[PDB]
Paper text:
Parkin is a cytosolic E3 ubiquitin ligase that is recruited to mitochondria damaged by depolarization, reactive oxygen species (ROS), or accumulation of unfolded proteins (Narendra et al, 2008; Jin & Youle, 2013; Ashrafi et al, 2014). Parkin is a member of the RBR (RING-in-between-RING) ligase family, which uses a RING/HECT hybrid mechanism to transfer ubiquitin from an E2 enzyme to a substrate via a thioester intermediate (Wenzel et al, 2011). Parkin consists of an N-terminal Ubl domain, followed by a long linker leading to four zinc-binding domains: RING0, RING1, IBR, and RING2, collectively referred to as the R0RBR module. Crystal structures of full-length Parkin (Trempe et al, 2013) and the C-terminal domains (Riley et al, 2013; Trempe et al, 2013; Wauer & Komander, 2013) showed that under basal conditions, the protein adopts a closed conformation where multiple intramolecular interactions inhibit key sites that are required for ubiquitin transfer.
Author numbering: 1 to 73, 140 to 330, 332 to 337, 345 to 347, 351 to 353, 359 to 373, 377 to 379, 391 to 410, ...
Write the structure that this text describes.
């Protein structure tokens, strides 16, 4: 059998595999050509990952069928997750901060803090009074920081607003495993995916060249379920793939623009008929060296793997930590205050403790 193997590239090289050939042996043969540990390689066919024990007959692979390989080398409750450009260079939980937008000083006092993503992403959406002297600024300018290490106020990361604390134990749409955090799509059902599958998914589309181009916005991916009007608008979410794969994604304009012009290279490093450049000659029909002879997701997972909602019971209401009078939460803001005048405890919904900067940063609000 011939199967075309696409590995960090648009073109797929052919591999010879017998009827009983194991997915591990395929991942052994691809490891020789590419020189990488087999225990990090992941074979994906039609969107489904193939486990090592499986065989060609079980998979329902056929002649010239395309398989991708992708390489993969009380606790703090975190609402916010960011991409830290350094030193981490990977997605991390972040701290949510605010400042006076008029003077750029982190002293902006909020009557009531933020309740959701729109409150902290839409500029000039919130308001307060700044504690700078001779500063009139009322504008709340929210920013984020990586939480994996200390950071100067100035050193800010971008929030990945789709990445969500899986506090509802929602299973993945791709793998059915309950992970944390998870990416939640902006389709009608708010479909949930784990970040391991988001990676697998983004990479598979890069090799396939199945990215979508929002003309004004750029190139993106919709929900994995194919849902309409679910393109990821916040394109910094592709930073999650890491630099190799992000870098690849950025080069998609170049490569599509060349595709539209009628251009075509099949090297792993990089008028009607030689790479010059890299220096490697090849056929244009089959992409071989110079010499031309010789996608769905399951419905049951899709129903379960939605952000959806929880019907209120018992989450809905909690007694005041100090005085015990029931308080029900309004919106997603964790910052509770007590109307009982002999008490008036400001506390955190989630932690059950007095309100403070840690709760604020880790989870001023929750989704
Ligand atoms: Zn960091
Ligand atoms: Zn100010
Ligand atoms: Zn998954
Ligand atoms: Zn969806
Ligand atoms: Zn080349
Ligand atoms: Zn050829
Ligand atoms: Zn109270
Ligand atoms: Zn808290």
């Amino acid at each position: 059998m011939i199967v075309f193997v696409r590995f960090n590239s648009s073109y797929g090289f052919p591999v010879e595999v017998d009827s009983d050939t194991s997915i591990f042996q395929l991942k052994e043969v691809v490891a020789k050509r590419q020189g990488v540990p087999a225990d990090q390689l992941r074979v994906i066919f039609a969107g489904k990952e193939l486990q090592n024990h499986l065989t060609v007959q079980n998979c329902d692979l056929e002649q010239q069928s395309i398989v991708h390989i992708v390489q993969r080398p009380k606790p703090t409750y975190h609402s916010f997750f960011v991409y830290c450009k350094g030193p981490c260079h990977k997605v991390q939980p972040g701290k949510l901060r605010v400042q006076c937008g008029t003077c750029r000083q982190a002293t902006l006092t909020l009557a009531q803090g933020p309740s959701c993503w729109d409150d902290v992403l839409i500029p000039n959406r919130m308001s307060g009074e700044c504690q700078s002297p001779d500063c009139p600024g009322t504008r709340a300018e929210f920013f984020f920081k990586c939480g994996a290490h200390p950071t100067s106020d100035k050193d800010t990361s971008v929030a990945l607003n789709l990445i969500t604390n899986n506090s509802r134990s929602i299973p993945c749409i791709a793998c059915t495993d309950v992970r944390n955090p998870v990416l939640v799509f902006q389709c009608n059902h708010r479909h949930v995916i784990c970040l391991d599958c988001f990676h697998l998914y983004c990479v598979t589309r890069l090799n396939d060249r199945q990215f979508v181009h929002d003309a004004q916005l750029g190139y993106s991916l919709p929900c994995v379920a194919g849902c309409p009007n679910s393109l990821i608008k916040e394109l910094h979410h592709f930073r999650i793939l890491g630099e190799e794969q992000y870098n690849r994604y950025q080069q998609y304009g170049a490569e599509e623009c060349v595709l539209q012009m009628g251009g075509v290279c099949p090297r792993p490093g990089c008028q009607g008929q030689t790479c010059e450049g890299c220096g490697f000659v090849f056929c244009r029909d089959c992409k071989e060296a110079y010499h031309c002879d010789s996608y769905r997701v399951d419905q049951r997972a899709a129903e379960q793997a939605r952000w959806e909602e929880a019907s209120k019971e018992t989450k809905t209401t909690k007694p005041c930590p100090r005085c015990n009078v029931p308080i029900e939460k309004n919106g997603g803001c964790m910052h509770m205050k007590c109307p009982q005048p002999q008490c008036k405890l400001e506390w955190c919904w989630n932690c059950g403790c007095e309100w403070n900067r840690a709760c604020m940063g880790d989870h001023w609000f929750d989704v």
